[PDB]
């Protein structure tokens, strides 16, 4: 119904006065200091991503470090995210430091440790010790990137396999490898993830974006290796594979958020199919009320061009109508060469999409998506947002300390903004992955508990005041549903 | 309520058994013998687009003869548009051939025609003669593809601009113009497009893609130089900038359908804002039940290299989101090196997201816009597609000989094909820009005038069945739109 | 949503330009004359009632002939319904004549035949054999109308019950008697019932209203005892007691349709349940596609007064307004001293009703109650029918030899006329228990068996603008679904 | 939506828990006694009605006083409604004290007061001066009931009728007369409605009803002569004729709630007609949020038989299906002989009727009829019905004071029960004419302003508690509506 909205739209209207959609930056040489940090937050960064394939402890440090003072002197709340290097699959060395694969050629894989380093083109190593169990005649194994498609014709011994080379490609040392017709059963966390998931847990970070999620059970693998310690901490699936992507759901339903990795996804699958897996995943994630990233190749030609393709640009725009929480850059913001011009141009698409999407439509297919009965925190969340709708109020307020009453009534997506008002510095960064909301931190050691709750309202109100969502005269739909509950529509003074 | 249904899909399921979405390609030196044609026939093409900005007529009427040819030789029917080169604004010559225009500098730009053949990074001619009345200070003027921007500061004379020059470039010879900021009133055709035109009517065209249309009354200035054999030609207006898109409903209201030219509006409009545009002419044009084409920027980096990016298959993939009865090949057929492959590669992505899209979202949005009491047509054929989803048929007959009602019920998108018979060659190719029917030609003299309707009902059920579409016990719905009838048929 | 659209309406506007309920007659000495019955038929008669509790074959033959000359005088086609005596429970014959019950008495009632004429206040005979088996202690047996009641206390033994009196009345011989708590096991058809009904079907009667009807297996054995030659005649089950009711879904199945005998279900059940059980069953055969009528007391003091009560005409209009394909009259026409007078004023109050009555909440109620996919009659039927709201039409036409197309089509409920075309004149008479429907008789032998249908809907079309319900330049939606199909909305010239 | 709620009924079930509709009885000589107030009370009356057509002021004052005896000893408030005599036209006298009127003769009706002594079948007065102004020839006078209808033929004179007898009957002295074309243009109070008015408020009555209420100016004339110190009391309408009928939308407007008058508005409209207004009005209440009285004609045969008839049944339960949210009972219990017998089986009918009732179709319905935006107390009240229905809540609890959120929240039809706490006594006694509340008083006085709500609150959820409207482990709906909240409670 986002049709008969097309049809009343006008490009040359003001955009809103708001952007729902967050934006997660990579943090790499381009924008590591703190200066440059400073000008990401300025440009629109509301999540700090580290990037665990590569760099030290020392080195993801200073990140972390410079992160908070950039933040602290901004006066933001920024959320820290590690994102983890995960388990791979890699070649041995070939002697002479490479070697090269021709089409029509045989060729042995083995995961004989032997040959580890001295494969050649004629039989190498795979690092994976499960290869020969996984893959059958017929199926595919990529290499380097998925350039070089060698195809399985038999098992030539119990850790070897005859293959056809399909087409020709010169491989160095150590490439990945993919399986796409296959079930890979590599552990959720590599040795290197646990001790560096430990370390995020030491350091306080918000967030761990966990690398080619396969199932459910690999999302609880990842909160054993957080301990006792990480439990607060938010674990975002990274869906990179059709295992992935067939198990959706229980990952969903385990995971605190999902990240769809389309350029992962694309190794193995056709580009116009993780398109639609793309729409699938967030819509799922949106129904679930729990955050969705839409990740990789995003204004990817924007790493050394000053301006990106009309493409990529149709693409940022497109994850958003489909309902994307938050869209990331890599190289672009790590690496690049205009790092605070691609974050603006992303604010920019974001809000320009904003301002055509009906959110009526997501409010009420989600809200038809409920049973009767419903509990009482869906039916307060659900009917809060709909009283925005009846009385087009300008503003919500909602009280939550642990951000889950905010996330709630995000789900059903209010066409105004919500403030959420919370007593914990944490819950302020982790809803910087959650869309339309911006969070008011509560000192209530010092300003006290507010039992009445009418200070934390109140400062609800004066927030939205300052950016101009409310003025006097128009209505705040204020919300709290403790994990009690009241809503109330109020009149602004 | 596509959220709804994208919960319930599998990217691992198989494929719809029908392409819904029609794709147009433009014909050129990759493409323009008659085995090239049939290549590209094969690979899914339904319209043979004409670039009239280049080529003479004996180009062009050789285009014309071999798209007959290769579809004749392939037994199917083809639409051949004849694609207007319109009204420009370019510059004139420089000295020397060249002129190094520079950030910061200043220069005069007029339309003083004694200029056109001497001009210089100091003054040169543009040869738009109402430039001064329709431009302002602080107005910008692009020039080269929107490159070169220039920015107006004063009138010098009642000819002449004096310019800021706001980035450096250098511009050689005649380049064109835009002016994002202004209202251009050139004319609707140039004495060019009436010779054009006049001659598309001559050789048969089924429709003309008119280029640069800003207003409902040029729809009308089209429709004249076609003069009155060209009246059953399809008008369908290419949008173009921003007076076009201000325009859009009585534009729509006097053509027959609309090309949505993304490059040719982002010379001026922001990209964000043309995905934005697209959106809207897109729906516009569903609710008006008249075809809407995607057109330029489609899978250009497959030109020179044999896949596209990523985000352009998304890009045509989300064109079909959208409602795009078209998507539109221009260089990547017309002078690429892998014609057949992207031809084939658009209609792999346009099958993929059909098989996401759900249709019963279009069809209820568009029937809860319809103003109550309803004429017949609109009743009848709302009524046919309810049918379908209401009993779950599996196809469509629809008796239709200009095509109207094979349109109207396209509009209403049931989520089965659509087989429409027809006893006119020109409507089954004209419904090439219709998505989602296919057109079965019944000859009449042949085989009578059938005013029983039996043998063209038979034909239609006929065709569904040899496609996989029904077979015994399934429902096929049945429908002639001013005398009309619905039937709902079990199929034998 | 009958609600909205009173809102809207105006006392003071015209009324409607057709009359869709139906009115039933009963025959009797008030009314059996050819010249009474043309009186009835012109007041707004459609359907002949002959109440077989009473009179003989020969009367009834009178009433047969009477009407069909009346009908055939008048140019109309009348229907003819034989409502069956039924099973009946009656008390013996009392010593002296009579028997004075008093209140606090112990009297016993016995199924032993020897006592059928020797009654007497301390012990008498009720003709019911399986009395004891159906009731138990606590049980109430009413006697004469309901009037005395009597409390079973105990069994005194295997064929007699002893009962307390719970009120005074005095009874005389051979009063009915009914079992509220209690499961009535007598068979469907008496017989009396047997002769009955083999004489309806020798002189082609249309429909039996068939008594006293307790469960589904019931109507088979009135249907079995109609044989092979009254194979096309209705059934239409009278509902009676708690039996009924509680069986009501198979009994509509079996069915043709339902009368809703309120008189006799007070007689068990308190009256304002009775007016509940009225609403449930004229909307589940509203659902079914069957006729349903609602009979007793309907104007019941127009049988000697020359107006009703408010709160009779207030009765008749609501039971259109629940869903009434048909109101019935039973001694207001069978004895009464007005019978042209109130046939005329329940067609005024039915006229009244319906131009109150929104009739697409019904169509709308009945087709959300339909599951998808539906089969094609019913899509046919439901689609032409909204066609008529979509277009405004103002008239329907529906070629249906058997008339299961014109119901189908009535039950779907349009706000116009329906004209149905007929190749057979039972048909005719058949529908006159349909509301909204007019039937046409289309001559095939004489006329052509017009394969193409456009002689059939050329007199349907006609027979509409000659009644003022279409004139050039309106729509009449026309539909065909033998049980092939086929929809047009026609443009009339 | 009642037709699928129809289906899946059974007449076996237990009825509800609560009954919503509420019983408004006329007190008389078979009432009027302290202990016979208590039987009516303890029968399911809410209201006492004094009929102020016939009794002093004496006679008013001493069922004022025992209702609220008889209310105080059962620990419970009852409402005393004031049931003005009004404006009335009436014949003079006839000589002889009588006057034969017979079919087809001729008679003079005449405004001149020389003839209220001393008037004859040949010519006799009628009372209101503007007869002749307001009548025309063809108009009928209806006199006696509307049993004798006589035609008016001509203006003998300015103030003399000529009438034809359109047919017989005698008519004793000072009969009433109606005037079924007629606009007629009395005064909206009498004098004597004046005093009995002032009389009203000083005695403390909770609401007024008003006779023969014609148009909006009318109800402020009411409201008037209430005066400054009558502001707080409740002005129900009466609806007696055509007039009322027409103006009903701005006299709704102006009153607070309707009574339908079926007896009265019958003398000049066809019963079938005023079954049609009864609908109307009702519903027209029902969107306004103001109560309705359906009155007359209820269960009319029980004043004298232990029963009522069947259709005297039928026509309670229908009031109820309609929407009304009272019901009256006149000479039943004012004269009757069976005053307890007759409120207790209304009071079975409606909860009879009430559990066959789909709540949810009002309650969208009314909904559905809301301007959007909605100001803040309609999005509140409707809100927190809608969460009864999401949430399957047993009861509501609403803090009002002036009962006008009680009101607000009853119109949305929740289905389950509403309990009122409220500090006003008067508030208590006024929501004994909306359907589906019950009040809890809370004596803030004795017990402090309670400005956090909590005590009231746990009041209210008690009460329902008490009448097993809920228990541990329900759903309550809290709501308070310029200020406001609802919470969705999980009971303890
Ligand atoms: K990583
Ligand atoms: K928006
Ligand atoms: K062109
Ligand atoms: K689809
Ligand atoms: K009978
Ligand atoms: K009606
Ligand atoms: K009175
Ligand atoms: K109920």
Same mark, same amino acid.
């Given at each position: @119904?986002?049709?008969?909205?097309?049809?009343?739209?006008?490009?040359?209207?003001?955009?809103?006065?708001?952007?729902?959609?967050? %934006?997660?930056?990579?943090?790499?040489?381009?924008?590591?200091?703190?200066?440059?940090?400073?000008?990401?937050? $300025?440009?629109?960064?509301?999540?700090?991503?580290?990037?665990?394939?590569?760099?030290?402890?020392?080195?993801?440090?200073?990140?972390?470090?410079?992160?908070? =003072?950039?933040?602290?002197? !901004?006066?933001?709340?920024?959320?820290?995210?590690?994102?983890?290097?995960?388990?791979?699959?890699?070649?041995?060395?070939?002697?002479?430091?490479?070697?090269?694969?021709?089409?029509?050629?045989?060729?042995?894989? +083995?995961?004989?440790?032997?040959?580890?380093?001295?494969?050649?083109?004629?039989?190498?190593?795979?690092?994976?010790?499960?290869?020969?169990?996984?893959?059958?005649?017929?199926?595919?194994?990529?290499?380097?990137?998925? %350039?070089?498609?060698? =195809?399985?014709?038999?098992?030539?011994?119990?850790?070897?396999?005859?293959?056809?080379?399909?087409?020709?490609?010169?491989?160095?040392?150590?490439?990945?490898?993919?399986?796409?017709?296959?079930?890979?059963?590599?552990?959720?966390?590599?040795?290197?993830?646990?001790?560096? !998931?430990?370390?995020?847990?030491?350091?306080?970070?918000?967030? %761990?974006?966990?690398?080619?999620?396969?199932?459910?059970?690999?999302?609880?693998?990842?909160?054993?290796?957080?301990?006792?310690?990480?439990?607060?901490?938010?674990?975002?699936?990274?869906?990179?594979?059709?295992?992935?992507?067939?198990?959706?759901?229980?990952?969903?339903?385990?995971?605190?958020?999902?990240?769809?990795?389309?350029?992962?996804?694309?190794?193995?699958?056709?580009?116009?199919?993780?398109?639609?897996?793309?729409?699938?995943?967030?819509?799922?994630?949106?129904?679930?009320?729990?955050?969705?990233?839409?990740?990789?190749?995003?204004?990817?030609?924007?790493?050394?061009?000053?301006?990106?393709?009309?493409?990529?640009?149709?693409?940022?725009?497109?994850?958003?109508?489909?309902?994307?929480?938050?869209?990331?850059? @890599?190289?672009?913001?790590?690496?690049?060469?205009?790092?605070?011009?691609?974050?603006?141009?992303?604010?920019?698409?974001?809000?320009?999409?904003?301002?055509? !999407?009906?959110?009526?439509?997501?409010?009420?297919?989600?809200?038809?998506?409920?049973?009767?009965?419903?509990?009482?925190?869906?039916?307060?969340?659900?009917?809060?947002?709909?009283?925005? /709708?009846?009385?087009?109020?300008?503003?919500?307020?909602?009280?939550?300390?642990?951000?889950?009453?905010?996330?709630?009534?995000?789900? /059903?997506?209010?066409?105004?903004?919500?403030?959420?008002? +919370?007593?914990?510095?944490?819950?302020?960064? =982790?809803?910087?992955?959650? $869309?339309?909301?911006?969070?008011?931190?509560?000192?209530?050691?010092?300003?006290?508990?507010?039992?009445?709750?009418?200070?934390?309202?109140?400062?609800?109100?004066?927030?939205?005041?300052?950016?101009? /969502?409310?003025? +006097?005269?128009? /209505?705040?739909?204020?919300?709290?549903?403790?994990?009690?509950? =009241?809503?109330?529509?109020?009149?602004?003074?």
């Amino acid at each position: @119904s986002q049709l008969a909205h097309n049809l009343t739209l006008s490009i040359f209207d003001p955009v809103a006065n708001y952007r729902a959609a967050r %934006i997660i930056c990579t943090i790499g040489p381009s924008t590591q200091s703190v200066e440059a940090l400073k000008g990401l937050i $300025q440009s629109g960064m509301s999540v700090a991503r580290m990037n665990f394939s590569h760099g030290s402890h020392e080195y993801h440090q200073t990140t972390i470090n410079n992160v908070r =003072q950039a933040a602290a002197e !901004l006066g933001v709340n920024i959320a820290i995210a590690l994102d983890t290097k995960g388990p791979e699959i890699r070649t041995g060395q070939f002697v002479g430091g490479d070697a090269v694969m021709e089409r029509g050629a045989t060729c042995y894989v +083995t995961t004989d440790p032997a040959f580890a380093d001295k494969g050649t083109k004629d039989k190498f190593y795979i690092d994976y010790q499960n290869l020969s169990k996984v893959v059958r005649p017929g199926n595919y194994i990529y290499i380097d990137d998925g %350039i070089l498609i060698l =195809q399985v014709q038999s098992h030539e011994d119990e850790q070897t396999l005859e293959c056809t080379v399909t087409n020709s490609h010169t491989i160095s040392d150590r490439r990945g490898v993919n399986l796409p017709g296959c079930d890979v059963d590599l552990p959720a966390v590599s040795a290197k993830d646990r001790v560096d !998931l430990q370390f995020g847990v030491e350091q306080g970070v918000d967030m %761990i974006f966990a690398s080619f999620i396969r199932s459910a059970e690999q999302v609880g693998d990842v909160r054993k290796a957080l301990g006792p310690k990480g439990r607060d901490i938010m674990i975002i699936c990274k869906i990179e594979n059709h295992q992935g992507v067939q198990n959706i759901d229980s990952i969903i339903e385990e995971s605190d958020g999902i990240m769809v990795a389309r350029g992962d996804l694309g190794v193995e699958i056709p580009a116009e199919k993780v398109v639609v897996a793309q729409k699938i995943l967030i819509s799922k994630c949106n129904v679930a009320g729990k955050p969705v990233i839409c990740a990789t190749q995003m204004l990817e030609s924007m790493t050394y061009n000053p301006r990106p393709t009309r493409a990529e640009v149709s693409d940022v725009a497109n994850a958003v109508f489909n309902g994307a929480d938050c869209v990331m850059l @890599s190289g672009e913001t790590a690496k690049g060469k205009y790092p605070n011009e691609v974050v603006q141009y992303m604010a920019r698409i974001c809000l320009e999409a904003q301002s055509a !999407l009906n959110e009526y439509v997501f409010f009420n297919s989600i809200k038809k998506l409920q049973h009767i009965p419903m509990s009482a925190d869906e039916a307060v969340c659900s009917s809060a947002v709909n009283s925005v /709708y009846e009385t087009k109020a300008k503003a919500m307020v909602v009280l939550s300390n642990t951000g889950r009453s905010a996330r709630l009534v995000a789900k /059903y997506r209010p066409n105004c903004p919500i403030v959420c008002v +919370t007593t914990r510095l944490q819950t302020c960064r =982790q809803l910087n992955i959650t $869309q339309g909301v911006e969070s008011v931190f509560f000192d209530a050691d010092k300003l006290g508990h507010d039992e009445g709750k009418e200070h934390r309202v109140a400062a609800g109100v004066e927030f939205a005041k300052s950016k101009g /969502y409310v003025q +006097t005269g128009d /209505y705040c739909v204020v919300i709290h549903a403790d994990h009690a509950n =009241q809503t109330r529509i109020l009149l602004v003074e």
